[PDB]
Design a protein around this ligand. Sequence first.
Ligand SMILES: [Fe+3]
Ligand SMILES: [Fe+3]
Lengths: 458, 431, 470, 471
Amino acid sequence: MKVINDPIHGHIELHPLLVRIIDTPQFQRLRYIKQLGGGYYVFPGASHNRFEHSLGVGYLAGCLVHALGEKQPELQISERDVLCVQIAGLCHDLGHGPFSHMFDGRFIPLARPEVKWTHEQGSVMMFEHLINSNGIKPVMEQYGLIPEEDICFIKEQIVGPLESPVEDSLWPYKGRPENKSFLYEIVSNKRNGIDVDKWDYFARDCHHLGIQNNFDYKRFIKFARVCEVDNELRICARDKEVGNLYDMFHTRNSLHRRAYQHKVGNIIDTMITDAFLKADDYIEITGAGGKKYRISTAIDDMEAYTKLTDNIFLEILYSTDPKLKDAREILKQIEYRNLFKYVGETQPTGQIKIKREDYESLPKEVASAKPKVLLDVKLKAEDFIVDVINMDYGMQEKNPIDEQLIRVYCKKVDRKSLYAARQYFVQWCADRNFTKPQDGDVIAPLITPQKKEWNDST
Amino acid sequence: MKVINDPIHGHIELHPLLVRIIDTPQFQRLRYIKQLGGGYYVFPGASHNRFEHSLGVGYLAGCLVHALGEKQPELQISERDVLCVQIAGLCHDLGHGPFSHMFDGRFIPLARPEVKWTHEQGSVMMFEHLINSNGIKPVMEQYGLIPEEDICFIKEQIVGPLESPVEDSLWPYKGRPENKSVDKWDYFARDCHHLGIQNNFDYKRFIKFARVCEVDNELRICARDKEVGNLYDMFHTRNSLHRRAYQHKVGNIIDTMITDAFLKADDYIEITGAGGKKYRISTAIDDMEAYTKLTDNIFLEILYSTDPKLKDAREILKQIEYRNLFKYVGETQPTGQIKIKREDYESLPKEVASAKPKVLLDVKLKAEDFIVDVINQLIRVYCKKVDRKSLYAARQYFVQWCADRNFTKPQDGDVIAPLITPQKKEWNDST
Amino acid sequence: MKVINDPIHGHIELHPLLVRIIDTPQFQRLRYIKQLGGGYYVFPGASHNRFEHSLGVGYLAGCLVHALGEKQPELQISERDVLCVQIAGLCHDLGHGPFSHMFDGRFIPLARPEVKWTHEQGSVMMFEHLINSNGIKPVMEQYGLIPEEDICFIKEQIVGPLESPVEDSLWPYKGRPENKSFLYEIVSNKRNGIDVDKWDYFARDCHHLGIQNNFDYKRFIKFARVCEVDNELRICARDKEVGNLYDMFHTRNSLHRRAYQHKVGNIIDTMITDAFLKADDYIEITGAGGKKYRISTAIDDMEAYTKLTDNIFLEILYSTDPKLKDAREILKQIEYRNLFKYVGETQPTGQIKIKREDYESLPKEVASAKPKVLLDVKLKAEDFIVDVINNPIDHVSFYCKTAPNRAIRITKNQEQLIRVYCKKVDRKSLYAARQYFVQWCADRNFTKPQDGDVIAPLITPQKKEWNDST
Amino acid sequence: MKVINDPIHGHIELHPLLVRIIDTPQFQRLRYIKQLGGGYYVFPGASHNRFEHSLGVGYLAGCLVHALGEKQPELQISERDVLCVQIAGLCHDLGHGPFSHMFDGRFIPLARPEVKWTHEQGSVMMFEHLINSNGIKPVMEQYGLIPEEDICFIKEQIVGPLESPVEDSLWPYKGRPENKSFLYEIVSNKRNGIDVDKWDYFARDCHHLGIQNNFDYKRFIKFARVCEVDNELRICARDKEVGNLYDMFHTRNSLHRRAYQHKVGNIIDTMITDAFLKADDYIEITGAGGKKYRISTAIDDMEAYTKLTDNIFLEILYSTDPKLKDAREILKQIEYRNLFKYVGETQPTGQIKIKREDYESLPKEVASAKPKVLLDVKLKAEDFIVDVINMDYNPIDHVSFYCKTAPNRAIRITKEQLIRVYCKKVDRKSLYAARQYFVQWCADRNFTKPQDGDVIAPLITPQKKEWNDST
RNA sequence: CCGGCC
RNA sequence: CCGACC
Ligand SMILES: [Fe+3]
Ligand SMILES: [Fe+3]
């Protein structure tokens, strides 16, 4: 058992097995990839990496489990359950890619349109590989828990429903029973949204970025207890966390609308992702048997998944090879904060939402926009841009109870080039059937008038 | 007008010249080093970038200049003084080495013994290189600033001494006024905020409680007579932060391991810059081109290469692939006048490796397996070995070396040495 | 320019006129009036008086009006109205009598059923007496105020429209023209209940009772802004502080269900009220011109109401007079802690709510309630005591975004109790009182007791009027 | 086994005997005696009373004795001692008069200068009256106490040695044998100054005044063990809390510099004292047998002293008797804030001091000043007042040392009277004359020259050679 | 600055 | 479980 001090988490004490397994290099790659991701180009202070966020999530899940077992001993969950919860929370986001939010949102979504997968499956696979490489089976036996069940429980908590839930009204998870889901929801609240990881992320972002955290998660955990709803085990705020929970929801909205939904930071992230894509074949990491896998193709290789940090960006910034001139230009452009210029903002309408495969064609489709306007420079794939920041979850019914931001970036920063990019963005919005801009009366003095809808003020 | 959002000083007002300087390749690359260095391993919450600390210091300096100008109309504060303050607060540590203090305090001895230089020389060279590469001399001129004079004044404001005279022919201010007379407070506040260390002193109160006074017919900074509590709290916070950054057990181990990794891969790492030069990590300060490609990425890159030619070097990362840091024995304090100075910095590990204690020992280490690092007067004792017998042998050798150095007696020297500590009659005086 | 240090609001920096109003007999009388009333004999910590509460209320009213006036230079909030709101805050409780809400609550109605008296009317009367006796009016002239308007405005802020508001939907206040309709929302508010009085006494009660106060009025005051709702200027809050308002109302409910509705803090109040009643006819209090008023009629004169404070309690406890022997006796039964025992509680069904004018008639009906089974003890009329005791998205606006009169004010939010106490404490007496209480709760169309089935099995089915839960 | 909620100590559990003792008229008399006395008219939040103070002190004494008997079983602390220490903590202030320390600090020594009276004597007498009147002795016998010696023990804890020894006449206390000496330092220590009463009233004063209280008695009781010090078992603390103890003393100093010496709470206390002194001969209080006792003599009979609380203030304020007129007016000048002005402050030099018997003679000497200047104000004894604010009598002092692994060797112990003169008249020339008279009187009495003494000393200053000597 | 004294 | 129901 070892205790560490953090700005928000506080005490980092754990079990002897968890203490022994915490100081590992497999989860050190979390410390080498920023959880804030594009926040380095956004938040001057919030340079925290996935290690701090994951440790806070695990500690908060363990504290919640301890509080539930103390105030509600009817669960009869022994120390093995808490140890398994801590081991699972130690890998909350231990399967993402370089720059975190850029990989599963921009890099993985574009590198392999034919293979759509997010950080969840990658996290499960990476945690399984790390467990296999550690060889902590005798150590787990010294902890009193059988590995053949601890590994399954950790994987189920990390991923979720891993049994391909059929329409039958059985247990969706093959690890947890019909009356054993109370402990696994502390790591992530897939329905209520009150997750230890989410609260830790919100608090850390607010603290290291300069925002106000009015939530008191400790009181929520103290007053939560285990209750029965819809003939199932759950956790809810008893009577007096309505103000605290509403403040937490407002803070989450502020964080996800001011930091994860900014403008310049999204442009910087898009430029970084595009530069990595142009250099995908130029940074090959050694794999198993002496083989090599590209950073683009390493999402299915754990040798380079354990070797996928933001140092790839550093390699891109300090390439010692002569074949990376195309990526060197983008690296030099991003070195002096000379990234692209935003042409506006947009959001689609209706229930139709594009998949991961359509993201790759979205840049080409947005560049292919061509209204009846003569442009000095044609909006090509490398000249124009379609930045599609997908918004996971978000649409939660009765947030107290309980698509994608589109941006047009110009590779050229000339005034005439800016006007051409704005015209191309208007053409793309018309093609995608997007609503008129808020300042569209001036932003589109020659593109909006083409359609009679703009003139129909009534 | 550019605004930078940081939790140290909120928003920082930067004019077009200040914005261009802050938005520069060197300024952007300045955020690639750690203030706490290896202590980031020991303390997770402290991972701040150096560029943010420099920006906060510059904002504090600009605010102080504005307050001095507004409070005293007779001060006649023009744009030149504010521009010099901003340039200094920006390039105060512009070219700080890998992990800032770690490189310039550990890696210089193994870099090039012929020329000695702290982080100040590298900072001055990096600022000069940034000015040369930016090509914004007309931009600075259009703001009313003299380029050479401002650059020299900013460099002098840094630890580096502009002039040779100590106090006879003015001060080390060959381009500045010796009579004429902050960053430390801003850095301390940033470190306290990042590491979670409570700071009882507010930087704003100290900034607002400064005045220009005529002492010895010279302008000097004077504080309020009722601000002793703020001063004390500030000093306490600074000391606490310094101890946390330097005295960290894991930090210390990471430090020494970083230096070992840097030395081991001298013939397996290099850079490219002007003239197609291929210089190793030892020559990263003499040439500004080497400093341009400088980042803490080695702390991962040297740890991530998968080549057989560096397999043993890769094995250094293997020491991190199974977490086991060097054991801590103890420390002591200097006595008399004999101390391990910078000249003895490159010889102290060799002196430790050559020790022959007269005690029952079975495990010995060579120069490469023995590390002698001091905290500069306390010198800690860390043994890279993991065996209990090896640790005891290393402790006995360290005790013999300290007894031959006649240093201060340790806290529990009787337990560490049953006879070696008893050998000296001077150190056995319990009264 | 005094400043008063407070353990809740810190510094309460004042104005010379407020100091003149404060250092008077009629304001310092508040220094000996319990804020929680009888709650001191149930909560040892709640020893605070109305004096500091009134100081804090004046402070908070000044803070809110000053914040609104500095934020918005269009409302034309002058220093005159700021001072007038501060005066209304300080004088909002000048009319309290012995043991605060026990006096105009359970005492005066049970003593004088023919008079409608409230502490706000007493506040108006005491403030008029304070400005007349102490010669404040020349000072009010000095400091920019015009008494002929400002005094009426202060009285209206304390109690409401003095002049029997006319039927048409005109402006019912004769003090301020309607273009300052927001100013009548600072001190006392009935539309939504966001008034500085409630903030101050919630914080003070939580400080003195050990309860934990989560609401933070400073955040509200910062967000507080005047917005236009239903063509009238009102004070609203930023949409962020909605959770803070939830906390405030949670604190309100806690203070009500733990402090102000205490099971035994009301028994003690009943005993004190009975002691005052028995001593009402033998405690002469002098008025203006030597006219001796009693406890109950002292509300008809402000020279005799000024001399009427909590000391009356002890003035009956220390009596050597034989005429007070009964009343003093009751007070003694409290020092020994020999209080009346609880019997049961009930709630009113529908809208037929018992009023204060019927309070003096309440026990007799309980006396007329005799259970349909044998009773060992036949409790007389005075042998039982029947004591009566009186959402977040109310008419409260919520400033939407960066727009002055945005007025996002819907949010769609997305009676009384009766307690029976027994003078006798025998087991058979307890059973008889429980049976009589069950009979009363089963025949007066009132809700059945919480534990009525265990309190009395032969007085449950009395009538069908009080046996329907629909 | 009831429990009382306190804003300071949270839940306070009480033995049935403690409740029986609490629910008596003599104990409930404390509800109507303010803790800070005249500080209310200065600190609006400081309206708390002695009743909750006594409750909390009993709580703390019980907690400390229980801890000390749980850690070390060789001390052999039994339930009898626990109940006796708790009772002593409860009744340690049963004898407080109106406005607390003002009664035995300013009123009684000035109303009856020939009578010695401390509130500990009144506490002992009131406790005896409580026990006798309320039939507590049968209940004390029932639960385990033996009144003949247990009551003597409680009285000794309240006041000290019930008899008169000289220097070394063996063990003074007849309550408990010497091998339980520590039991006499819980409720009221006189050597170390660490007693469970000061903890509670420091916490309560800081709660109601808004001052910050960094001390934590829980972390003291947690690490307290009894150790031998000069062949006397004493309660001792871990050295790891010694710095914490510093905080407590720091808090103490704050409370004695802001609250108890406010220079406006003292002039208000003086005005209340003068009003009481003038209404003394006419206010009647009935005692046992109907014998009317005045306010001053009421201390001699506990039945009359039970009915003597802060209410007397209001009883003089709300009166209509012509004989009380003057007294009543001095209470009304307080209600207009038309208080008397402080002419000056000084301190005694060396070891010269004013006792409780010379307080009455002090104003006459103050009025007896004869400055060698043209003083147009003929100030008499009624035109001046002299308040001797006796400061109550160290971070180490009788320090304690519960050093780890050393449960026997406690060797780790390593680390006045103000006089304020006020003037009844309010004329500016009268104020200057009063300042000059105060300076002259302080010079004549060899007292320390005031810091602002020379401000109103343009004529008689050259007369005094020592006054001009700055060294 | 007689309910303020960082 | 009459100064408790945190
Ligand atoms: Fe009220
Ligand atoms: Fe006491």
